[PDB]
């Protein structure tokens, strides 16, 4: 039961005669549901992923310049130019300057002067368009069968969830089956965003913030760059030659200014999808279907022992792993209570009913006893497991 | 001489002390100059100058667009570029069309589409830097030597001036000379300007005016034009289809928008040379070297016939011209006056010592008249012209 | 002089006989010096700099993380310790870890968990302290020597001024001799401040705002780095493992921060030389000890010729040039007036006796007219190379 192994658990009780109970399940949390009479279901979101997504945009993040070109001409010997002002490729500013005899000049004044440079991209942030039907949400199953830790990993149902996969059915062997039904038309707002892509690290992040960005962009078709000045400053001009500096690498500050966004992993293992970080998904449960497996079976009436002791868990709930011996298919009974006597129990299991299939099972049990000092307790007659506990 | 034909003269009066006389010349009109015992002086501003002035800018205000691309993406597929978005001489635009299932696309949204025109024009107006230095002036001057009309083209003297040779000297032929400093051309206006050529005629302008016109240019050595998007425009779009077109020519509005300013003229006859209009200059004659032609002579004694009665300026002078066909070289006296019998001259002879140079020749004569009611005379004995006169 | 070829000037004005005039010299300005009867004097600093000064630090920027490994334990069985957690050259964290039956382990609790990466420096800024006593500065002087710009270039005075050698002596000929005290060991802030180096670019700032950076920083050549935390991020402990990461390259985001200090160049080509931006000096002036040149010499009446007509300096003052034929060595006379008549000169001849030396050769020449309404005037004979001006 593998909300057993989550930090962060949250139960839930359906009313006797309901049909449907319903839940929020996000990525670190884990949910049990529970009715009087089925087996308990533990529910989790693994992940929300999205395939393929299209560039939009690469934003460079750090120019650098080469063959830097200057003209200049004298205050009133008309506007300079230069050919390299054709050319795209070429970032360009025009001012003018002061000039004075000594420049090799021959008047005093307000001359006229252009220089531009070669821009090239080192390193770009690609903007992904996002595919809002290919996204994805993958929810686990399983129920409470008692099965122990080794298990788990093979026992989970993996269930995909997309606009077309509206509902789902987890099917659970000798324990009759479940629907789950989940709000993925609405879960997420993808609609008004881009996944950011840096080297080996992504966000996700608002259209509008990213297309006010103050740095020079491409399309992802491949182009011209075309805002290049926001990372180039042109030194004020000294008569004889204005100087042209890159801005330098922005990527510290450019990712600072994510730090609020989602956070999104490439899996490079899993073919190329886009796996997001805490999202989440607002879903139903329908339990009509399930069935406590060994309702039939005769009690446990011999011999068991601890294979490991009743233990707590940060949820309030202790946990234990029982195995019989020379025992049929048979059911284990548990209750919690004050003392020895035994005369009503107070603990709620649960692993509602708790099962051996063959002599040679190990089953786990999970208890939430009272508040207090209590005994738990296993099995019964003169060989009772019984152990104290204490809140 | 030509200050008769010019119709707005002045009159200016030396006192004999007076060994420079100044003068303010203005582009339409003509100065005169007397001076107590010697020769008076015409003198006019001819011309005001600039020679082969730099090409700061041309101004396109027709142009046409040869070829238009367009690429589209829908609405999930990222931006589109296009090849000639890369090359200079093509304007370009960026939108968002709305695109659907009608047009191809798999989703309903807003695609980007990106459309270019190879811009070029065809006719530009052409700016040139105005040299303060540079400006040339042509002066002209003649003396009242009593030449006929026909002869003041032949007896001009021109005096051509620079920010060099501030002085310069008119010889007159048996007359003597007189020099001139002139001030340059003081052309108040002409600082912080352009000279702005549109085929067949030209204005000056001012450089604010001109760089802030809201129309596509490029420097005087060619190149790219820099703005063309004043004078293309894009429809708004409809699915993968922009319609552009240009603005239609700008002549008229730019004409219109020049009236202000004063007009130039290009010696097309002759040189690549600007004729300025509305220039002023100041200058000073020195007068002391300039002497008269004839006080030896004798005193013309016959008859004499008027070849031109005695008329109107319209400057308020008398003019008139006179025949001999007697006598050798000799002077011929003028007054005017109010007694018919022998009476003192109450006139100023504007042509101050009239002569005849062979004995059958023809003089012109200009008096400034009294106010009021008079007799104009010419010759001395019985058989004097004489003309009756009024202010 | 070659103060006329800078855009800001000034003009201080001593008084007749020995004394001392004080002087500013900000790096970009060149000042200008007159007194009553010694001629004018322009001066302005060449450079401040260092040599070879010491490390003080270096400050990394960007790291990358080369080796990583982790140890993790039980929560019952007590912390753990890992080999490299002493090794200076590792970045480490220690924290506890959430741990559980999904997890391996016995007990669900908190486990403890420390993980390590062995630091290594990609890039860094160097840090140099430096000391007033290390300052060099190099100063330019002129007066009017009449050399061609063509030749100020090795005709210039070459002042170098370090505070640990004498103080020097202008080396004119025939203008006498002047010298300079100039607060040399004191004019500067630089206290408890020192130069910042990045790849061929550097700046100056103080110690405690260096001390302030949040950076990883190694004091001596080798040793450990101080701080390395500030550039690793250890993402939150999951099951028995960590994930850690390099915070990435900050060096735009701290040029960033340095764009409001003074420049500095690390020299071409002496290439252990420090060339700081916007220092300045202040002074006293030997004046005294100069003399004019040729102060008797005849006051020339040849025929006189421009090569450049009155030029506005911009400084409210013009220069001019000026050629003769004959007069070879003669004083050339300037003057300025309310009118031709020239009564009283009314400006400053900033060339106070203007120098004559060839008929090759114009001869350079300032003034200064009064504000209003003036004429400047060349020459006092007929020969009056004459100039209307205004304020």
Same mark, same amino acid.
């Given at each position: 039961?593998?909300?057993?192994?989550?930090?962060?658990?949250?139960?839930?009780?359906?009313?006797?005669?309901?049909?449907?109970?319903?839940?929020?399940?996000?990525?670190?949390?884990? $949910?049990? $549901?529970?009715?009087?009479?089925?087996?308990?279901?533990?529910?989790?979101?693994?992940?929300?992923?999205?395939?393929?997504?299209?560039?939009?945009?690469?934003?460079?993040?750090?120019?650098?310049?080469?063959?830097?070109?200057?003209?200049?001409?004298?205050?009133?010997?008309?506007?300079?130019?230069?050919?390299?002002?054709?050319?795209?490729?070429?970032?360009?500013?025009?001012?003018?300057?002061?000039?004075?005899?000594?420049?090799?000049?021959?008047?005093f004044?307000?001359?006229?002067?252009?220089?531009?440079?070669?821009?090239?991209?080192?390193?770009?942030?690609?903007?992904?368009?996002?595919?809002?039907?290919?996204?994805?949400?993958?929810?686990?199953?399983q129920?409470?069968?008692?099965?122990k830790?080794?298990?788990w990993?093979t026992?989970?149902?993996?269930?995909?969830?997309?606009? @077309?996969?509206?509902?789902?059915?987890?099917?659970?062997?000798?324990?009759?089956?479940?629907?789950?039904?989940?709000?993925?038309?609405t879960?997420?707002?993808?609609?008004?965003?881009?996944?950011?892509?840096?080297?080996?690290?992504?966000?996700?992040?608002?259209?509008?913030?990213?297309?006010?960005?103050?740095?020079?962009?491409?399309?992802?078709?491949?182009?011209v760059?075309?805002?290049?000045?926001?990372?180039?400053?042109?030194?004020?001009?000294?008569?004889?030659?204005?100087?042209? @500096?890159?801005?330098?690498?922005?990527?510290?500050? @450019?990712?600072?200014?994510?730090?609020?966004?989602?956070?999104?992993?490439?899996?490079?293992?899993?073919?190329?999808?886009?796996?997001?970080?805490?999202?989440?998904?607002?879903?139903?449960?329908?339990?009509?279907?399930?069935?406590?497996?060994?309702?039939?079976?005769?009690?446990c009436?011999?011999?068991?022992?601890?294979?490991?002791?009743?233990?707590?868990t940060?949820?309030?709930?202790?946990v234990m792993?029982?195995?019989?011996?020379?025992?049929?298919?048979?059911?284990?009974?548990?209750?919690?209570?004050?003392?020895l006597?035994?005369?009503?129990?107070?603990?709620?299991?649960?692993?509602?009913?708790?099962?051996?299939?063959?002599?040679?099972?190990? $089953? @786990?049990?999970?208890?939430?006893?009272?508040?207090?000092?209590?005994?738990?307790?296993?099995?019964?007659?003169?060989?009772?497991?019984?152990?104290?506990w204490?809140?």
């Amino acid at each position: 039961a593998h909300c057993i192994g989550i930090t962060d658990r949250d139960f839930i009780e359906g009313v006797h005669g309901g049909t449907w109970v319903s839940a929020t399940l996000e990525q670190d949390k884990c $949910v049990t $549901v529970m009715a009087p009479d089925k087996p308990s279901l533990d529910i989790s979101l693994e992940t929300v992923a999205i395939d393929g997504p299209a560039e939009a945009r690469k934003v460079c993040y750090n120019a650098v310049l080469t063959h830097v070109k200057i003209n200049d001409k004298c205050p009133s010997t008309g506007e300079a130019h230069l050919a390299e002002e054709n050319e795209g490729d070429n970032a360009c500013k025009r001012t003018y300057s002061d000039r004075g005899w000594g420049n090799g000049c021959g008047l005093f004044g307000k001359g006229s002067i252009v220089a531009c440079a070669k821009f090239t991209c080192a390193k770009s942030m690609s903007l992904f368009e996002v595919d809002q039907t290919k996204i994805q949400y993958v929810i686990r199953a399983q129920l409470h069968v008692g099965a122990k830790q080794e298990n788990w990993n093979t026992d989970i149902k993996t269930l995909k969830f997309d606009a @077309l996969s509206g509902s789902q059915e987890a099917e659970f062997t000798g324990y009759g089956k479940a629907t789950l039904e989940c709000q993925v038309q609405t879960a997420v707002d993808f609609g008004n965003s881009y996944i950011a892509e840096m080297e080996k690290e992504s966000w996700i992040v608002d259209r509008q913030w990213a297309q006010d960005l103050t740095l020079p962009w491409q399309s992802g078709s491949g182009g011209v760059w075309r805002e290049m000045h926001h990372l180039v400053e042109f030194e004020p001009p000294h008569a004889a030659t204005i100087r042209v @500096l890159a801005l330098g690498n922005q990527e510290g500050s @450019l990712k600072t200014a994510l730090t609020g966004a989602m956070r999104v992993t490439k899996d490079t293992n899993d073919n190329n999808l886009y796996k997001l970080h805490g999202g989440h998904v607002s879903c139903r449960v329908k339990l009509s279907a399930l069935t406590l497996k060994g309702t039939s079976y005769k009690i446990c009436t011999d011999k068991m022992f601890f294979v490991k002791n009743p233990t707590d868990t940060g949820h309030g709930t202790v946990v234990m792993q029982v195995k019989v011996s020379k025992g049929a298919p048979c059911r284990i009974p548990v209750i919690v209570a004050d003392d020895l006597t035994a005369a009503i129990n107070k603990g709620i299991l649960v692993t509602v009913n708790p099962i051996a299939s063959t002599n040679d099972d190990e $089953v @786990l049990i999970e208890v939430n006893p009272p508040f207090g000092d209590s005994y738990i307790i296993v099995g019964r007659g003169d060989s009772r497991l019984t152990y104290q506990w204490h809140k």
